[PDB]
Structures are given as C-alpha cells and as structure tokens.
Amino acid sequence: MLFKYIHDVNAKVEEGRRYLSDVVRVALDKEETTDPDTQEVTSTSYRVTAYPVVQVGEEEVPYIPVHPKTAEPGQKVTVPTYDVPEKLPVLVRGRNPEATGDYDDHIWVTEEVEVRPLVDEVFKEDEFEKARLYYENVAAQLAEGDDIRHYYRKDLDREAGHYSVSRYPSF
Amino acid sequence: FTPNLFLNKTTPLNMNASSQKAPAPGTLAAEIGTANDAEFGKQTGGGAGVYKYAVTFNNSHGESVPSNIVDVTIANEDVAKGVKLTITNPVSTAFPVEYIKVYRSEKDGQRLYEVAKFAVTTDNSGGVTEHTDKCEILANTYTAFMGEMSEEVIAF
Amino acid sequence: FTPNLFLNKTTPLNMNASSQKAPAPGTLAAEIGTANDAEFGKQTGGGAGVYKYAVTFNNSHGESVPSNIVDVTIANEDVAKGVKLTITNPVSTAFPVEYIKVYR
Amino acid sequence: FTPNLFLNKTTPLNMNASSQKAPAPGTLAAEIGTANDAEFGKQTGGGAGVYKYAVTFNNSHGESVPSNIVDVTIANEDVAKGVKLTITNPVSTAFPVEYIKVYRSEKDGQRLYEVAKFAVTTDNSGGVTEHTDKCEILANTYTAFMGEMSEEVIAF
Numbered sequence: 276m277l278f279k280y281i282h283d284v285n286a287k288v289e290e291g292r293r294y295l296s297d298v299v300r301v302a303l304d305k306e307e308t309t310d311p312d313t314q315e316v317t318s319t320s321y322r323v324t325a326y327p328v329v330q331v332g333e334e335e336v337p338y339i340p341v342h343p344k345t346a347e348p349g350q351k352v353t354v355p356t357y358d359v360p361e362k363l364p365v366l367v368r369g370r371n372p373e374a375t376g377d378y379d380d381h382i383w384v385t386e387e388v389e390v391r392p393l394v395d396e397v398f399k400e401d402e403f404e405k406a407r408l409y410y411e412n413v414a415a416q417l418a419e420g421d422d423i424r425h426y427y428r429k430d431l432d433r434e435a436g437h438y439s440v441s442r443y444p445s446f
Numbered sequence: 447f448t449p450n451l452f453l454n455k456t457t458p459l460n461m462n463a464s465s466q467k468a469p470a471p472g473t474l475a476a477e478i479g480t481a482n483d484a485e486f487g488k489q490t491g492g493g494a495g496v497y498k499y500a501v502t503f504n505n506s507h508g509e510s511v512p513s514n515i516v517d518v519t520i521a522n523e524d525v526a527k528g529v530k531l532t533i534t535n536p537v538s539t540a541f542p543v544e545y546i547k548v549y550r551s552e553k554d555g556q557r558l559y560e561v562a563k564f565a566v567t568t569d570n571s572g573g574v575t576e577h578t579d580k581c582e583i584l585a586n587t588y589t590a591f592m593g594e595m596s597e598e599v600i601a602f
Numbered sequence: 603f604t605p606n607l608f609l610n611k612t613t614p615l616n617m618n619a620s621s622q623k624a625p626a627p628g629t630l631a632a633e634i635g636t637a638n639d640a641e642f643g644k645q646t647g648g649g650a651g652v653y654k655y656a657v658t659f660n661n662s663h664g665e666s667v668p669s670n671i672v673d674v675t676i677a678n679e680d681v682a683k684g685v686k687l688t689i690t691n692p693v694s695t696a697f698p699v700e701y702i703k704v705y706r
Numbered sequence: 707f708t709p710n711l712f713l714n715k716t717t718p719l720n721m722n723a724s725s726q727k728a729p730a731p732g733t734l735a736a737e738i739g740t741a742n743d744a745e746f747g748k749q750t751g752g753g754a755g756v757y758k759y760a761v762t763f764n765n766s767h768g769e770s771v772p773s774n775i776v777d778v779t780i781a782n783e784d785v786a787k788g789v790k791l792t793i794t795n796p797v798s799t800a801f802p803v804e805y806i807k808v809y810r811s812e813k814d815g816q817r818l819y820e821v822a823k824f825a826v827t828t829d830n831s832g833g834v835t836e837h838t839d840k841c842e843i844l845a846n847t848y849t850a851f852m853g854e855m856s857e858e859v860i861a862f
Contacts, residue, residue, distance in 0.1 A: 297542075330540075331571055
C-alpha cells in the first residue's frame with residue numbers, strides 16, 4: 276500500500292447503500308505475478324481501490340504539528356487501524372407475519388448486505404502517473420463533500436463517431 | 447400534582463438495534479464483587495436470589511444489540527458485596543462506541559430493565575471496562591421529582 | 603410504410619464496455635440440454651453445425667466486456683434438445699449484476 | 707528607487723507543517739561531492755567551516771515538516787567540490803511529493819534558510835533524488851531587481 280487516505284463522510288453519504296460506514300479508505304498498491312519456481316516476476320500492475328472500513332485496533336505514530344501548533348522532539352499520538360469488513364447492516368420497512376393488531380403490523384427490520392468496493396481500477400507497469408492522477412482525483416472528489424460520481428476512463432471506451440456501431444439500442 | 451405522560455419507568459430491554467449507525471455488540475462477564483456497601487438487602491424479601499445481566503453499547507446515533515445474558519447467584523451473606531462486571535469492546539465495530547447501559551432483571555425474574563448508564567473507559571477495539579453494581583436502582587420501578595418551579599431556581 | 607433509422611437487427615457483440623460502472627465479467631459454460639421443444643431445425647438445410655456462445659453482464663449503468671467464448675457442436679439428432687448455459691457471477695465487482703444477454 | 711516590503715530575503719525554516727494534506731517527511735544524507743566548480747570560496751573569510759543541511763517535501767497542498775539535520779565539514783581543499791545530497795521519499799505518505807526545498811545554514815551558523823528549490827526525479831515511494839549543492843545562493847542574503855517598466859516590456 277504505497278498511499279493511504281482516510282476520509283470522514285457526512286450523514287447523507289453514510290445513508291447510501293454503497294457507503295455503510297462513517298469512514299472511507301482510498302489506497303494505491305502495486306501487484307506482481309511470479310513464476311512458481313522462484314521469484315522471477317512476469318508483470319507488474321498498480322491498483323486503485325476505495326473501501327468502507329471498520330476499526331480493528333490502534334497503533335503508535337509520530338505527531339505532525341500544524342502551523343498554529345508546536346510539538347515536542349519525540350511526541351507521539353495514537354491513531355486507529357482499519358480493515359475491510361464482510362457484511363454491514365441496513366434498516367428497511369417490513370411487515371410482522373405474526374401481528375395481533377393495528378399497532379404492531381408495520382415494523383423496521385435489519386438486514387445484512389454484502390460489501391463491495393467503491394472503486395477498482397488496474398493500470399499497467401507503465402503509466403504510473405495515470406494511476407497517481409486517478410487516485411488524487413478520487414481523493415479530491417471525496418473531499419468535495421459528496422459521493423464518488425466520475426468513473427470515465429478514455430482508454431477503456433468505445434470509439435466515438437462510429438455511427439454504424441453506435442446506432443444500436445443502449446438505453 | 448402534575449402527571450406527565452412521558453415520565454415512564456425503567457425501559458425494558460430491546461432485542462433490536464435502534465438505528466443502523468449504532469455500534470456492534472460485545473461480550474459480558476459477571477461475578478460476585480468485593481465491595482462492602484451494596485444495597486441488595488433493602489428489598490422486602492432480601493437480596494437472596496438469581497439475577498440476569500446484559501449490556502448494550504451506545505453512541506450518539508443509537509443503541510446496539512444486547513450482549514450475552516449472564517446469570518448471577520447471590521447468597522444471603524453476599525448481599526453486602528456488589529457484582530463486578532467485565533465489559534469488552536467489540537472487535538470490529540463500524541461506528542464508535544461512547545457509553546454503556548446495564549440491564550438487570552427482577553429478583554428471580556425473566557425480563558430485564560435498564561438500571562445503569564455510564565461511559566466507557568476506552569474506545570479501543572477489545573478494550574475492557576470494569577464496573578461494580580451496588581443495586582442503586584431496582585428493576586421495574588418508577589421515579590418522581592419535586593421542587594420549586596420558579597425562574598429564580600430553574601430556567602431554560 | 604414508415605422506415606425508421608433507429609429500428610435495427612440483432613445487436614452485434616462489442617469488445618468494449620459501454621461504461622465504467624458496468625459490472626465485472628464472469629464465466630460461461632455450455633452443453634447439450636434435456637429439452638424436447640427446441641427450434642434449431644427450422645433453418646434451411648437442417649440445424650446441425652457449430653455455434654459460438656458468449657454472454658455479457660448488465661445493470662442500469664451499462665454493459666460489461668464479453669466473457670469467454672465457448673464452442674458447441676450440435677448433431678442432427680440433437681436439434682430438438684436445447685443448449686444449456688451455466689452463467690457464473692463475477693467474484694469481485696464494484697457494481698452488482700442485474701440481467702444477462704446471450705450472444706450467439 | 708522603489709522599496710518593497712515583500713521582496714524578502716532567504717526564508718528561515720519552520721518546524722511545523724502548513725496544512726493537513728502535506729506529504730510525510732522523509733530522510734536525507736549529505737557528503738562531499740565530486741564537482742569542480744563549486745562557489746563556496748567566494749565568501750570573504752573563505753569556505754572552510756561546518757554547515758547544516760535540511761530538506762522539506764512539498765506538493766500543491768502545502769509544505770511538510772523538516773527532515774533530519776546533518777552536519778558537513780568542508781576543508782580548504784574541498785571548497786571546489788560541492789556537497790552531494792541524497793533525498794529519499796517517504797514510504798507511507800498520504801499525498802505524493804512534488805518538489806524539494808533545500809535549507810542551509812551560514813558558515814558555522816545555527817539557523818537554516820532556504821537556498822534551493824527543484825522538482826523530484828520521481829514521486830514513487832522510496833524514490834531517490836540526487837542533487838549537488840554548488841553554493842549558488844548564500845544563506846541570509848537579499849535580491850534586488852532593476853529593469854525597464856512599461857506596457858511594452860512587462861504586463862499582467
């Protein structure tokens with residue numbers, strides 16, 4: 276994990292189906308494929324991902340002050356660690372199969388749903404600058420205060436201006 | 447006398463979370479304490495009996511799911527000694543935890559009610575909070591308030 | 603008679619996803635089924651031959667890339683039995699799957 | 707003659723970051739280089755002495771905290787040979803690095819001032835940038851501009 280960004284989303288984002296946690300993690304990582312015999316690598320790729328994460332522990336890190344503050348030579352602060360969960364709850368409207376009257380017919384039920392990544396992109400061994408730009412754009416768009424909305428990549432797209440192929444239904 | 451319709455008794459335990467942003471459930475361990483000022487013997491029939499204990503984890507967003515239920519047997523000579531509770535934080539909570547609620551049943555009862563409310567010692571995952579119960583509040587009871595209602599005493 | 607420019611034939615397969623929010627591709631398997639009312643024999647000169655199968659995974663946002671292409675050989679006596687497909691969902695996708703399209 | 711208050715001298719070093727999104731600090735190593743045209747001998751008393759070095763990591767958001775401070779001793783025979791700096795990028799940063807600012811002290815001084823500014827060879831984690839210091843700018847010094855000011859020469 277070359278880069279790591281922990282962002283705090285607001286209540287409106289936290290209520291979305293894809294965002295079922297109060298903290299979103301954005302990271303860039305490098306992957307390799309090696310032959311089974313030895314460490315002979317065959318290819319290298321960069322992956323950019325965003326995940327809803329949960330707290331699983333704490334760790335000791337150095338303290339980094341900001342301009343209106345001053346720090347001791349060896350001051351340290353504690354920060355939480357995060358890990359990808361498996362299922363997160365959500366409340367939906369439902370009905371009581373064993374209701375007895377008009378006051379306990381409508382209820383709210385809790386259902387657990389599968390967690391999926393928000394972003395998952397793969398870049399080749401070259402074009403590390405493109406992966407870095409994508410990571411920075413995702414982080415900035417999260418910092419804008421809304422959901423992640425833009426996913427368009429020019430490399431993975433159909434040719435524009437090809438009328439004999441774009442006339443088919445897509446709606 | 448001013449009867450108030452929203453002044454209720456101890457809230458009975460709820461088996462479902464109040465909101466989706468509430469923390470995760472944890473674990474509870476209970477045993478006879480070592481204090482010497484417990485008030486279990488103030489009941490009419492005495493403090494001897496069997497009691498049930500359960501806890502829930504809380505934040506500013508809602509109430510979590512009840513933890514495991516533990517049965518504690520109190521003898522007639524242990525009424526002066528409280529109950530020491532060991533509360534463990536959830537391993538992988540998705541929302542932070544801020545305080546705890548303790549639920550106790552009646553003497554030789556089945557249904558639990560809220561009797562205590564205090565903050566956590568630490569919010570780290572897997573943290574341990576130790577509390578000693580002295581039976582300050584009896585389950586399934588009411589509360590009333592009396593005082594001078596004037597601007598010179600109380601205001602908003 | 604009203605000719606329409608946007609009324610077309612069966613859509614040919616494309617190798618590029620229509621959008622970046624489409625689900626990830628999966629896997630496909632095909633074999634001779636056990637039906638008894640297939641219409642493979644209504645073509646000129648019978649229906650026995652070799653056919654190619656591929657599927658795509660779709661949602662409200664777009665269409666995925668094609669899956670693996672499998673080859674099915676249909677004999678003369680198997681024209682009345684259909685072709686059974688076994689579509690498998692992607693293991694890890696950012697957006698879920700909603701429906702399937704079959705390309706032949 | 708037109709005096710300007712914001713035409714400052716070499717900026718002294720600050721010990722704290724200027725933003726939340728600044729890059730993480732890295733490491734720095736310095737030693738005598740192999741150049742043959744360094745300008746450390748242009749000072750009045752010579753170039754012999756002990757100099758202190760430090761670097762900071764920058765991006766579009768802000769500036770990081772200073773890295774470690776090293777001491778380099780220059781003899782009278784090594785004046786023409788510059789100082790070689792090895793700057794190593796952090797391995798666990800949140801936002802990537804864009805350029806480096808070099809801070810140097812005076813001859814046997816104690817405070818550091820900005821004397822250089824250049825981009826990185828690569829912004830990848832663990833990247834290594836090598837720069838040779840030839841004392842182009844002296845610490846704690848000024849700069850003045852003279853020229854023809856007219857709409858036909860300069861404009862905004």
